[PDB]
């Protein structure tokens, strides 16, 4: 007798205080819907990051018998269980809107216990795993204590049917522990990828959407130095009551590698920000903007030959992929841009950043001194105004007496003295750079600069930042961060603050990247292989698509360069528009949001929890709801 | 001196247990001429001022500056970012200071209605948000430097660090900006001038 | 808007016990016609909205602006004086809050270091010193009022008061701008002008800042006035006696107008009274509307600016 419709619900992942990718974007931007669904009941679970939980997560005291309601009661005795054995954790609020209560364990705790939990993985489960790979230990290790937790969850609380919802191998070894067990929860899966996927499309060699039945798993599974991995991965597929992805595209990706037809979709939502007016998004950007003009600036002193106010600003950005990400493409399309451009004597200017993580040494003392040197011509721009100030003043107050004929100062030198201009041309000389110098292609000292993907490719395609190439190249090869000495933006904030979106992944099951984009009301190019890309392409006709700022590049059906053809068409089209035409496709675009809020998509996360509890609970759910409803798929039974 | 201040602002970021209004500031500047200079002597009288102060009990503070040119391959890092986060820091607060007087402001004009009893704010809630205080936790952030990290001796990347006559002095005598030293040691090996990214004063100002 | 909120602030020193930010600007403009442009309805109309915005409980306030060249002495004392002493509290406020800034800054700049447990301050006497609070509450003193008095209705030394159309309407309804009437009145008897010293705005912009123009005409052949008011994106309560009213009536069905901006008095097939109740009831339609509600009425009104092209 456990209750259906007044359920507990467990939600597991290694990225649930800690930003690795999209799926902590996931968890983060769901968590107002599934608070205000579940309030107490709702549980995140992870591993401890014992250096960077601080910043996330307010810490809680949960002895206190004020820090859980008496029908919640049972959540605190299991967790005074795991205590009295040793096991460490954390109990608190994720600093984040919807404050989740969250339980992260600490893995050095149970460390310990590592061998016999290897070895009862492979005796009981089939799972080989060599001790080399200490992310396969950490999974091995959250999984058991996960296990363990929700086992004396079970039977130390009879009242709600429970939910243990996973996400991705690494905390999907569980999973297979609970079946094995039986114990008294109800499990869904989520892959948001899969590592042959992965591997496959990184070696950009085949034509992976098209040749993917042909493939054997177990052979390639092995080449790749896998085996181990894709085991975890396969063993959360199959012991899950329900089995989910993010997207079509990863649902018959999972089908053909994974063994298992997903039971349905869980499309990634994001929490959409209004505004009181519409507007309001427009003059964000133009705010965020000038910030990215004031860094631009600096970069290019002593080399700046461009107009801002007829200049366009081009993004990539993701974690260092370079295949799959479409990084390689991105940087080709802006050579023949480069091309197209000069051919065709336009005036405008684009400067592309790439903000990609790679191994640095900071960033350079040349990126610092020229906002340095940029930020001093401003204070002494100001000193000379104010002075300006003064005489404009004078003048005008005295008009038309001791002299003073005009109404107004006529000749520069009534205004200017030459103090004002010795100081100003002291900052002219500052900002100067030696003969032949070009604006840098990077911001940082890399670690292995010689060897670097992005700048071999920057530097084959000559994309050096001179003064008649109309597209500008900066690498800036970490994550935006407020806190950023050249930049001080937010990735938010610079998303904002940019024109287009470029994210021309090869391998996307999602790619949150354009989504967020797309809900700031910013254009953006993706490809008909990514998830976000085929979903968008399934509503909107996709001639009609690229009028609200979504451009899908055919990477299916057609040959790599005809793909580059066509992602230079794009950019050359939007760099052909008028401003009035990119304010209204901005509006255009942010309307599309209401496609992307949580409010639409967390629906499905609903319709997988239902199932979960119509597979664990057949004849209770019968009971409660009137017919023996159909459970072969999440929309069969909804 | 306040654009002094500035400077030193940023080279103690993180390490700043000083008060600027009790801190003196001393200097040695020419031509890199170790013995002929004092440079030695001026090294090593610091050293023994320093441990003359804390024996005293002093609650003074010198700062001591050596301003002559050896070879370098220009500011380092450290000097320019500890500079731009101070920078930062500034603009932050300016844009919290903004608000603060907004609703000082409505306090001022509305008082006595609308159930205010008092001329002025008394609880700092009324004046400082949650917003506001979350971007200056961020720039003080910034600001912190790692685990039993100093305020550093030089500004500069040496050309020769390990062989230089006043670097291998200041280590000798172990003045390497230690909380507990009232005196602070920082070697600027290059001349003063007002284009100067990190302390943008000519010799003579300074 | 900010501009106009600036001198109201000023206008009502020592009486400000109400939201700007839930406040509602009306005008009406032109020649002096007090029949033919509608002043008298006008009046007539915010005293009675006035009852019904009190008796309803809302928090609202509406303070509607008369722009009417009337002869007279030009600013009066009282009005500059506001107008300055409002300035004398913002430039101490601005010392103020830059010493508050140097001691958060020390706080921010020294945590964790001599004694600094909490990364922020946390009192705010470590902020705010009494040679603060001493210019601040100076300030304040110079923005009391004396006992019982009430802001003005009129900016201007008037040259024949005693016999001024508009004042005596205003007297006759009783429209005060007490504390406790909803709707405010402020007669400015001189076309406006961004050289003003006390609501330094010409009349373009003055339009762009309100949220409601209101122009009851009775003859009228075209209506300039309400005209430019829809090109500035802001709506405007017109009658069908009126050329752009009836204009607008031929080319809008009149329920479908009032969501354009556009909304149209009966002064042609109604008694007067019917006609005041009318125009009542626009007024109070439009000051339950929501910020959002506002904000897309007044795009719909831009919108519809095209037709007058
Ligand atoms: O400077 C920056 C730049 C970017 N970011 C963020 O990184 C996130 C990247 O997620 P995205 O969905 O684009 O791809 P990713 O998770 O890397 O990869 C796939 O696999 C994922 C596996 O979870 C799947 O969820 C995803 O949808 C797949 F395509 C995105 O939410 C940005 O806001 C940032 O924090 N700072
Ligand atoms: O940053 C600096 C420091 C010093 N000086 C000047 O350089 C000279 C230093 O003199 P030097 O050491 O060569 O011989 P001194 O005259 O000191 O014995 C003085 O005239 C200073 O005005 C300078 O131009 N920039
Ligand atoms: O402060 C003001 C108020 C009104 N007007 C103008 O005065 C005209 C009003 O016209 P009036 O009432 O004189 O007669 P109408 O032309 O409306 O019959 C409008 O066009 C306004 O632009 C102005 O310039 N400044
Ligand atoms: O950055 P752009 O695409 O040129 O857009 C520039 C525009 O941004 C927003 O719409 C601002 O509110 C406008 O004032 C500005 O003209």
Redesign the interface.
């Known amino acids: 007798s456990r209750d259906l419709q007044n359920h507990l619900l467990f939600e597991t992942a290694t990225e649930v205080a800690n930003r690795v990718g999209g799926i902590y974007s996931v968890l983060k931007s769901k968590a107002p819907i599934t608070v205000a669904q579940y309030k107490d009941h709702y549980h995140l679970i992870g591993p401890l990051n014992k250096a960077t939980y601080q910043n996330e997560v307010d810490i809680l005291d949960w002895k206190k018998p004020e820090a859980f309601s008496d029908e919640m009661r049972p959540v605190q005795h299991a967790l005074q269980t795991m205590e009295s054995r040793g096991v460490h954790f954390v109990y608190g609020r994720w600093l984040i809107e919807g404050a989740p209560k969250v339980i992260l364990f600490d893995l050095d705790s149970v460390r310990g216990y590592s061998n016999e939990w290897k070895g009862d993985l492979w005796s009981l489960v089939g799972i080989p795993s060599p001790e080399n790979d200490f992310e396969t230990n950490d999974a091995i290790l959250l999984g058991y204590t996960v296990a363990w937790f929700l086992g004396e969850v079970a039977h130390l609380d009879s009242q709600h049917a429970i939910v243990a919802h996973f996400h991705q191998w690494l905390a999907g070894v569980a999973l297979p522990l609970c079946r094995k067990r039986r114990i008294d929860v109800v499990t869904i899966f989520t892959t948001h990828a899969t590592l042959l996927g992965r591997y496959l499309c990184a070696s950009g060699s085949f034509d992976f959407y098209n040749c993917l039945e042909s493939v054997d798993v177990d052979h390639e599974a092995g080449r790749f130095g896998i085996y181990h991995r894709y085991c975890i991965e396969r063993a959360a597929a199959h012991s899950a009551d329900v089995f989910t992805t993010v997207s079509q595209i990863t649902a018959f990706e999972a089908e053909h590698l994974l063994k298992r037809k997903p039971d349905g979709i869980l499309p990634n939502g994001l929490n959409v920000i209004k505004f ?3 507007h309001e998004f427009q003059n964000l950007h133009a705010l965020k903007k000038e910030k990215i003009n004031d860094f631009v600036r600096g970069h290019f002193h002593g080399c700046f030959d461009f107009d801002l106010d007829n200049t366009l600003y081009f993004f990539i950005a993701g974690r260092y992929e370079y295949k799959n990400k479409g990084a390689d493409m991105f940087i080709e399309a802006l050579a023949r841009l480069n091309y197209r451009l000069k051919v065709s004597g336009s005036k405008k200017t684009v400067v592309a950043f790439i903000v990609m993580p790679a191994k640095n040494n ?2 350079t ?1 040349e990126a ?2 020229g ?3 940029v ?2 011509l401003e204070n002494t721009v100001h000193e000379v105004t104010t002075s300006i100030g003064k005489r404009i003043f004078d003048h005008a107050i005295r008009y038309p007496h001791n002299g003073l004929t005009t109404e107004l100062p006529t000749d520069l030198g009534e205004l200017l003295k030459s103090s004002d201009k010795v ?1 100003l041309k ?2 002219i ?2 900002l100067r750079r030696p003969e032949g110098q070009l604006p840098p292609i990077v911001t940082h000292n890399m670690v292995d600069d010689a060897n670097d993907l992005i700048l071999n490719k920057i530097r084959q395609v000559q994309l050096f930042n001179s003064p008649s190439d109309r597209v500008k190249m900066i690498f800036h090869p970490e994550f935006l961060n ?2 950023n ?2 930049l ?1 933006l937010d990735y938010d904030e610079f998303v904002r603050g940019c024109h287009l979106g470029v994210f021309p992944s090869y391998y996307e099951p999602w790619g949150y990247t354009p989504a967020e984009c797309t809900v700031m009301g910013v254009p953006s190019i993706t490809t008909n292989v990514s998830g976000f890309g085929s979903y968008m392409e399934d509503l909107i006709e996709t001639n009609q698509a690229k009028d609200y700022g979504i451009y899908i590049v055919d990477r299916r059906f057609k040959a790599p360069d005809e793909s580059v053809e066509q992602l230079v068409d794009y950019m050359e089209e939007f760099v052909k528009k008028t401003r009035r035409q990119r304010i209204n496709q901005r509006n255009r675009t942010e309307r599309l949001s209401d496609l992307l809020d949580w409010k639409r998509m967390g629906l499905e996360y609903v319709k997988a929890r239902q199932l979960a509890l119509r597979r664990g609970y057949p004849d209770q759910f019968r009971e409660l709801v009137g017919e023996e409803l159909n459970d072969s798929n999440m929309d069969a039974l909804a």
């Open positions: 009181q007016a519409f900071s960033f003392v610092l001194k906002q340095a040197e930020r001093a100081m002291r900052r000389l500052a407020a806190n000495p050249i001080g």
